[PDB]
Amino acid sequence: QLIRQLLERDKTPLAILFMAAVVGTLVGLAAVAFDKGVAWLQNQRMGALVHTADNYPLLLTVAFLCSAVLAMFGYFLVRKYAPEAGGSGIPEIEGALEDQRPVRWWRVLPVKFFGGLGTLGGGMVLGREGPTVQIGGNIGRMVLDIFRLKGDEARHTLLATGAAAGLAAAFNAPLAGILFIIYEMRPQFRYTLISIKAVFIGVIMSTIMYRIFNHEVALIDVGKLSDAPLNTLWLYLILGIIFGIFGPIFNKWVLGMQDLLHRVHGGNITKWVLMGGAIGGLCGLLGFVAPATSGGGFNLIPIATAGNFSMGMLVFIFVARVITTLLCFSSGAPGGIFAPMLALGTVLGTAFGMVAVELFPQYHLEAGTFAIAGMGALLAASIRAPLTGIILVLEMTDNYQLILPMIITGLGATLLAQFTGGKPLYSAILARTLAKQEAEQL
Amino acid sequence: IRQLLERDKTPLAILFMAAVVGTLVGLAAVAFDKGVAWLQNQRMGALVHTADNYPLLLTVAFLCSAVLAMFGYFLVRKYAPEAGGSGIPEIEGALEDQRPVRWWRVLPVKFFGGLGTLGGGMVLGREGPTVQIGGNIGRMVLDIFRLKGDEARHTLLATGAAAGLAAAFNAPLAGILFIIYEMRPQFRYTLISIKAVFIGVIMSTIMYRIFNHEVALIDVGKLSDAPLNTLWLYLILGIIFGIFGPIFNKWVLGMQDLLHRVHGGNITKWVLMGGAIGGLCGLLGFVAPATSGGGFNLIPIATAGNFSMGMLVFIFVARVITTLLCFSSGAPGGIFAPMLALGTVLGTAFGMVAVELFPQYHLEAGTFAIAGMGALLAASIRAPLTGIILVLEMTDNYQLILPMIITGLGATLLAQFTGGKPLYSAILARTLAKQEAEQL
């Protein structure tokens, strides 16, 4: 026939495109088994809090010793077995695509899936996209060892497939794992057009294989809000300057708290997992006396957008939240920072709307329509990926009408986070740990 | 207090004048969207003396669409021969410093010649004459204002190619994703040139939503959902578009030389094969208004179950024929929009087969018309991430964001397997090959 000898004349891209369909199945399993392990521990922690609900001094202790032993175990697997399994994964699947950081598929996966569950099920303010990309990247290398595929354009197209299979299966946004790994993250490499179709395959087969088990489950349920009038759109630029100034100060604070939480222990392992037990048990203690300033962050985004918080409470879920967010990502725990910054951005958003209601009453603006244009304005001024933050809150909130103010608060964030000495958060951590690798080598 | 502004004297001038290309395109993309709509109603206003004498008075739909046809085939073939086609080849070829930009010649013939032979009833889109009008205003503000450099005429030109693409679709994301990333995807834009495309797109969608307010250009509404047990049906639709990718690409690069033989470059014979294509699709604008038409007139009709299967092999056979005649001749009109209303006809022709072959799926026929809309665009132009968000901004169906990647994948993968270049880099490669042959 004709298709017989034609489908084998190249045989190199047809194998690495089928290998991107066995990665997205494997990461899509590892994104829904990691999700059903973090939704079970939170359904077992609160099932033990309300069981023996008699003595209130016993309530705070059992909310502490049930999150300390998940933090004393979550920090234990990281800084003993696989020390690159700390923090997010995006600083470690950026140098690994740049051929600077090695990928240990046999070591990150038994740590990021198990020890990354205790620092997520323990009530800490960490994202479930960090421990899904770094599992996904360390799965896209696993299929090049069990199948023994070789090459320099074959290791970089499956390491970016699983890195896109971890972001498009932890947020259920198949246009935010494609728009991040290809274009916005590493804005100097291009992924010539056989390496994008292996990102497209590993996102399709990692959202289909994610929506099979995690079906009829809402992750963001803000509803359908109003629209942004054209005499209101200049108030989204001042929201950009607020986020664009707070961006590089928050970007310096996480890199500044890594000089304090690394200087309290000195380097010892027994001083480190007990520091995690006193910082991952506090966020399991704060999740019972004030549940807004804890958790993964996806609990208050349909709440703060509804405007049920007052202005006196909206500072409390920003002052006692950015202190708590800096104490779980910059403290060396396995966990991302998008879902913290997707809730740290929606608090400052709706705190700008309730100011704009009383200050400008003639505009008739909704107090929560800045909380949809506030989520994708803090990770566009710290990570500096503005087109991801627009097409991450579109697949979650499903609000098409705020497509023009999302760029006004997206441009205004990323313009002041470059003028005022800014730096990308997911490109200044990798450039910082590479200096320590150049220090212990010499 | 003082160093923060004088150090940013020059690099901020491409961030303030990027709001001038944004503003002046939004005032020239709504004087274009109204001029293409004012000239349409004057044709239908003169067709009220036709229903009594339909054989003899049929020429009113034919001659009045041919006088306006020879006003766009004459301003282009005499005053500015680089404003023919779709413009985006002559903008991409000018973003690499290979093609010259004549803003003193393109703008008086892409807005005047691009209004007659786009508002006369052609089968062209209104973003080809909006990107190149946008990609000349970004050169208009650079010659009349005292600024220069190597990254200044590649940023104001690259925020003009995005201010026109975002003010011709009401899509503030399909103009950003095309120019920076999807068009020529081996070039890296500077971080001050990406955030100057953002100011051009924002202040052009603002100057478009002020005039054309509370009106959606695609009114499909909210369609049904796509279950996970029928998602392979949006892949065989991609394979059918993937073979039709380099076949429609070979036809439009074949009929450009096939139509070139009938006049041979003589100016008085261009407009006779240019007036007989405007007069044909003006007569087709009264006999069967789904055969002709510049795109969006038949997209809300041929999606929510109106046309039968016996008619959708006529709005695809006789529409491809009048698409390869209106754009491959040399009219001032883009092809980015008449591939939306051509992949949604074959897309809904695949939807009315799957509902007949698979009764167990409970599939609406219309959910294959949104996936097929950004499929032929992702097969012949091969920008598979603009054509997903472009249909997302207009048709507003966020439920079908997973099938639009699958039909987006299969249309850009099988087109790469059989062998096919992007369309806006293949017409440019023929023009740059014709440039070296004309001087020798």
CSV table of N, CA and C in Angstrom, one decimal, chain A residues 80-175:
chain,number,residue,atom,x,y,z
A,80,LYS,N,16.5,14.7,53.2
A,80,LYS,CA,17.3,13.5,53.4
A,80,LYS,C,17.5,12.7,52.1
A,81,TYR,N,16.5,12.5,51.3
A,81,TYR,CA,16.6,11.6,50.1
A,81,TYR,C,16.8,12.5,48.8
A,82,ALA,N,15.9,13.4,48.5
A,82,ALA,CA,15.9,14.2,47.3
A,82,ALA,C,15.9,15.6,47.6
A,83,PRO,N,17.0,16.3,47.8
A,83,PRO,CA,17.0,17.7,48.2
A,83,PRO,C,16.5,18.7,47.2
A,84,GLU,N,16.4,18.3,45.9
A,84,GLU,CA,15.8,19.1,44.9
A,84,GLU,C,14.3,19.1,44.9
A,85,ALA,N,13.7,18.3,45.8
A,85,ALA,CA,12.2,18.3,45.9
A,85,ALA,C,11.7,19.3,46.9
A,86,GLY,N,12.4,20.4,47.1
A,86,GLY,CA,11.9,21.5,47.9
A,86,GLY,C,11.4,22.7,47.1
A,87,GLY,N,10.5,23.4,47.7
A,87,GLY,CA,9.9,24.6,47.0
A,87,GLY,C,9.0,24.1,45.9
A,88,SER,N,8.9,24.9,44.8
A,88,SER,CA,8.1,24.6,43.6
A,88,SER,C,8.9,23.7,42.7
A,89,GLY,N,8.4,23.5,41.5
A,89,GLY,CA,9.1,22.7,40.5
A,89,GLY,C,9.6,23.5,39.4
A,90,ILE,N,8.9,24.6,39.1
A,90,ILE,CA,9.3,25.5,38.0
A,90,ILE,C,10.7,26.1,38.1
A,91,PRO,N,11.3,26.3,39.2
A,91,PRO,CA,12.8,26.6,39.2
A,91,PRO,C,13.6,25.3,38.9
A,92,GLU,N,13.1,24.1,39.0
A,92,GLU,CA,13.8,22.9,38.7
A,92,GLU,C,13.5,22.2,37.4
A,93,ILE,N,12.4,22.7,36.7
A,93,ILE,CA,12.1,22.3,35.3
A,93,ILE,C,12.3,23.5,34.5
A,94,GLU,N,13.2,24.4,34.8
A,94,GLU,CA,13.7,25.4,34.0
A,94,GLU,C,15.2,25.3,33.7
A,95,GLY,N,16.0,25.0,34.7
A,95,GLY,CA,17.4,24.7,34.5
A,95,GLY,C,17.6,23.3,33.9
A,96,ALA,N,16.6,22.4,34.2
A,96,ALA,CA,16.7,21.1,33.6
A,96,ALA,C,16.4,21.1,32.1
A,97,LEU,N,15.6,22.1,31.7
A,97,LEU,CA,15.4,22.3,30.2
A,97,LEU,C,16.6,23.1,29.7
A,98,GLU,N,17.3,23.8,30.5
A,98,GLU,CA,18.5,24.6,30.1
A,98,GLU,C,19.8,23.8,30.3
A,99,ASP,N,19.7,22.5,30.7
A,99,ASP,CA,20.8,21.6,30.9
A,99,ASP,C,21.7,22.1,32.0
A,100,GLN,N,21.2,22.4,33.1
A,100,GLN,CA,21.9,22.9,34.3
A,100,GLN,C,21.6,22.2,35.5
A,101,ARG,N,20.4,21.7,35.7
A,101,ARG,CA,20.0,20.9,36.9
A,101,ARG,C,19.6,19.5,36.5
A,102,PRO,N,20.2,18.5,37.1
A,102,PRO,CA,19.9,17.1,36.8
A,102,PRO,C,18.5,16.7,37.2
A,103,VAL,N,17.9,15.8,36.4
A,103,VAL,CA,16.6,15.2,36.7
A,103,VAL,C,16.8,13.8,37.3
A,104,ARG,N,16.4,13.6,38.5
A,104,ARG,CA,16.4,12.2,39.2
A,104,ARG,C,15.0,11.8,39.2
A,105,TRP,N,14.6,11.0,38.2
A,105,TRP,CA,13.2,10.5,38.2
A,105,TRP,C,13.0,9.4,39.2
A,106,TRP,N,14.0,8.7,39.7
A,106,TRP,CA,13.9,7.7,40.7
A,106,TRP,C,13.9,8.2,42.1
A,107,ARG,N,14.2,9.5,42.3
A,107,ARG,CA,14.3,10.1,43.6
A,107,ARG,C,13.3,11.2,43.9
A,108,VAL,N,12.9,12.0,42.9
A,108,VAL,CA,12.0,13.1,43.1
A,108,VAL,C,10.6,12.5,43.3
A,109,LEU,N,10.2,11.5,42.5
A,109,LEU,CA,8.9,10.9,42.5
A,109,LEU,C,8.5,10.2,43.9
A,110,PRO,N,9.4,9.5,44.6
A,110,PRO,CA,9.0,9.0,45.9
A,110,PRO,C,9.0,10.0,47.0
A,111,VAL,N,9.4,11.2,46.7
A,111,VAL,CA,9.4,12.3,47.7
A,111,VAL,C,8.3,13.3,47.4
A,112,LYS,N,8.2,13.8,46.1
A,112,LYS,CA,7.2,14.8,45.8
A,112,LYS,C,5.8,14.3,45.8
A,113,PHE,N,5.6,13.0,45.7
A,113,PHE,CA,4.2,12.4,45.8
A,113,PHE,C,3.8,12.1,47.2
A,114,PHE,N,4.8,11.7,48.0
A,114,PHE,CA,4.5,11.3,49.4
A,114,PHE,C,4.8,12.5,50.4
A,115,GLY,N,6.0,13.0,50.4
A,115,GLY,CA,6.3,14.1,51.3
A,115,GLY,C,5.7,15.4,50.8
A,116,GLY,N,5.3,15.5,49.5
A,116,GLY,CA,4.5,16.6,49.0
A,116,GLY,C,3.0,16.5,49.3
A,117,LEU,N,2.6,15.5,50.0
A,117,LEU,CA,1.2,15.3,50.4
A,117,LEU,C,1.0,15.8,51.8
A,118,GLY,N,2.0,15.6,52.7
A,118,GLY,CA,1.9,16.1,54.0
A,118,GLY,C,2.0,17.6,54.2
A,119,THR,N,2.8,18.3,53.3
A,119,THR,CA,2.8,19.7,53.3
A,119,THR,C,1.7,20.4,52.5
A,120,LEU,N,0.9,19.6,51.9
A,120,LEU,CA,-0.4,20.0,51.2
A,120,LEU,C,-1.6,19.6,51.9
A,121,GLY,N,-1.7,18.4,52.4
A,121,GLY,CA,-2.8,18.0,53.3
A,121,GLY,C,-2.7,18.5,54.7
A,122,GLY,N,-1.6,19.0,55.1
A,122,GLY,CA,-1.4,19.5,56.4
A,122,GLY,C,-1.9,20.9,56.6
A,123,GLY,N,-2.6,21.5,55.6
A,123,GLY,CA,-3.1,22.8,55.8
A,123,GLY,C,-2.2,24.0,55.5
A,124,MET,N,-1.0,23.7,54.9
A,124,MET,CA,-0.1,24.8,54.6
A,124,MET,C,-0.5,25.5,53.3
A,125,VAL,N,-0.1,26.8,53.2
A,125,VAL,CA,-0.5,27.6,52.1
A,125,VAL,C,0.5,27.3,51.0
A,126,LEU,N,0.2,26.3,50.2
A,126,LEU,CA,1.1,25.9,49.1
A,126,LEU,C,0.2,25.4,48.0
A,127,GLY,N,0.7,25.6,46.7
A,127,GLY,CA,-0.1,25.2,45.6
A,127,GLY,C,0.1,23.8,45.2
A,128,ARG,N,-0.9,23.2,44.6
A,128,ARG,CA,-0.8,21.8,44.1
A,128,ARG,C,-0.3,21.7,42.7
A,129,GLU,N,0.2,22.8,42.1
A,129,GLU,CA,0.8,22.9,40.8
A,129,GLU,C,2.3,22.7,40.8
A,130,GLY,N,2.9,23.1,41.9
A,130,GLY,CA,4.3,22.9,42.1
A,130,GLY,C,4.7,21.4,42.2
A,131,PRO,N,4.1,20.7,43.2
A,131,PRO,CA,4.3,19.2,43.2
A,131,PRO,C,3.5,18.4,42.1
A,132,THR,N,3.0,19.1,41.1
A,132,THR,CA,2.5,18.3,39.9
A,132,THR,C,3.3,18.5,38.7
A,133,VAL,N,3.9,19.7,38.5
A,133,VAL,CA,4.9,19.9,37.4
A,133,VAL,C,6.2,19.1,37.7
A,134,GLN,N,6.7,19.2,38.9
A,134,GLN,CA,7.9,18.5,39.2
A,134,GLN,C,7.7,17.0,39.3
A,135,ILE,N,6.5,16.5,39.6
A,135,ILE,CA,6.2,15.1,39.3
A,135,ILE,C,6.1,14.9,37.8
A,136,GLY,N,5.5,15.8,37.1
A,136,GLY,CA,5.3,15.7,35.7
A,136,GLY,C,6.6,15.7,34.9
A,137,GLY,N,7.5,16.6,35.2
A,137,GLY,CA,8.8,16.6,34.6
A,137,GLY,C,9.6,15.4,34.9
A,138,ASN,N,9.5,14.9,36.1
A,138,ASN,CA,10.2,13.7,36.5
A,138,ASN,C,9.5,12.4,36.1
A,139,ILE,N,8.4,12.5,35.4
A,139,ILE,CA,7.8,11.4,34.7
A,139,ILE,C,8.1,11.4,33.3
A,140,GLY,N,8.2,12.6,32.6
A,140,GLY,CA,8.6,12.7,31.3
A,140,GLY,C,10.1,12.3,31.0
A,141,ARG,N,10.9,12.2,32.1
A,141,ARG,CA,12.2,11.6,32.0
A,141,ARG,C,12.2,10.1,32.3
A,142,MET,N,11.2,9.7,33.0
A,142,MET,CA,11.0,8.3,33.4
A,142,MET,C,10.7,7.4,32.2
A,143,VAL,N,10.0,7.9,31.2
A,143,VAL,CA,9.7,7.2,30.0
A,143,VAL,C,10.9,7.1,29.0
A,144,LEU,N,11.9,8.0,29.2
A,144,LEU,CA,13.2,7.9,28.5
A,144,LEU,C,14.2,7.1,29.2
A,145,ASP,N,13.8,6.3,30.1
A,145,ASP,CA,14.8,5.3,30.8
A,145,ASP,C,14.2,3.9,30.7
A,146,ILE,N,12.9,3.8,30.8
A,146,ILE,CA,12.2,2.5,30.6
A,146,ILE,C,12.0,2.2,29.2
A,147,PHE,N,12.2,3.1,28.3
A,147,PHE,CA,12.2,2.9,26.8
A,147,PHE,C,13.5,3.2,26.2
A,148,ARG,N,14.4,3.8,26.9
A,148,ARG,CA,15.8,4.1,26.5
A,148,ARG,C,15.9,4.9,25.2
A,149,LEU,N,15.1,5.9,25.1
A,149,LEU,CA,15.2,6.8,24.0
A,149,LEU,C,16.3,7.8,24.2
A,150,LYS,N,17.1,8.1,23.2
A,150,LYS,CA,18.2,9.0,23.3
A,150,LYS,C,18.1,10.2,22.4
A,151,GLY,N,19.0,11.2,22.7
A,151,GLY,CA,19.0,12.4,21.8
A,151,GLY,C,19.0,13.7,22.7
A,152,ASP,N,19.3,14.8,22.0
A,152,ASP,CA,19.3,16.1,22.7
A,152,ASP,C,18.0,16.8,22.4
A,153,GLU,N,17.3,16.5,21.3
A,153,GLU,CA,15.9,17.1,21.1
A,153,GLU,C,14.9,16.1,21.4
A,154,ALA,N,15.2,15.0,22.1
A,154,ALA,CA,14.2,14.0,22.6
A,154,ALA,C,14.1,14.1,24.2
A,155,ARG,N,15.1,14.5,24.9
A,155,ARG,CA,15.0,14.7,26.3
A,155,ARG,C,14.4,16.0,26.7
A,156,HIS,N,14.4,17.0,25.8
A,156,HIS,CA,13.9,18.4,26.0
A,156,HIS,C,12.4,18.5,25.6
A,157,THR,N,11.9,17.6,24.8
A,157,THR,CA,10.5,17.6,24.4
A,157,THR,C,9.6,16.7,25.2
A,158,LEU,N,10.1,15.9,26.0
A,158,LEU,CA,9.3,15.1,27.0
A,158,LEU,C,9.5,15.7,28.4
A,159,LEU,N,10.6,16.4,28.7
A,159,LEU,CA,10.7,17.1,30.0
A,159,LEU,C,9.8,18.4,30.0
A,160,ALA,N,9.5,18.9,28.8
A,160,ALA,CA,8.5,20.0,28.7
A,160,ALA,C,7.1,19.5,28.5
A,161,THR,N,6.9,18.3,28.1
A,161,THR,CA,5.6,17.7,28.0
A,161,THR,C,5.0,17.5,29.3
A,162,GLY,N,5.8,16.8,30.2
A,162,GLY,CA,5.3,16.6,31.6
A,162,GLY,C,5.2,17.8,32.4
A,163,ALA,N,6.1,18.8,32.1
A,163,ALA,CA,6.0,20.1,32.8
A,163,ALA,C,4.7,20.8,32.4
A,164,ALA,N,4.2,20.6,31.2
A,164,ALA,CA,2.9,21.1,30.7
A,164,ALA,C,1.8,20.2,31.1
A,165,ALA,N,2.1,18.9,31.5
A,165,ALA,CA,1.1,18.0,32.0
A,165,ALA,C,0.9,18.2,33.5
A,166,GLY,N,1.7,18.9,34.1
A,166,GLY,CA,1.5,19.2,35.6
A,166,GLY,C,0.8,20.5,35.9
A,167,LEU,N,0.9,21.4,34.9
A,167,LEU,CA,0.3,22.7,35.1
A,167,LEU,C,-1.1,22.7,34.5
A,168,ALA,N,-1.4,21.9,33.4
A,168,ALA,CA,-2.7,21.8,32.8
A,168,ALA,C,-3.5,20.7,33.4
A,169,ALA,N,-3.1,20.1,34.5
A,169,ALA,CA,-3.9,19.1,35.2
A,169,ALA,C,-4.0,19.3,36.7
A,170,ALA,N,-3.3,20.3,37.2
A,170,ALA,CA,-3.6,20.8,38.6
A,170,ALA,C,-4.5,22.0,38.7
A,171,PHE,N,-4.6,22.7,37.6
A,171,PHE,CA,-5.5,23.9,37.5
A,171,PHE,C,-6.7,23.6,36.6
A,172,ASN,N,-6.7,22.4,35.9
A,172,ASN,CA,-7.7,22.1,34.9
A,172,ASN,C,-7.8,23.1,33.8
A,173,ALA,N,-6.7,23.7,33.5
A,173,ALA,CA,-6.6,24.8,32.4
A,173,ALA,C,-5.7,24.3,31.3
A,174,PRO,N,-6.2,23.7,30.2
A,174,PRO,CA,-5.3,23.2,29.2
A,174,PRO,C,-4.7,24.2,28.3
A,175,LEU,N,-5.1,25.5,28.5
A,175,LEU,CA,-4.4,26.6,27.8
A,175,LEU,C,-3.5,27.4,28.6
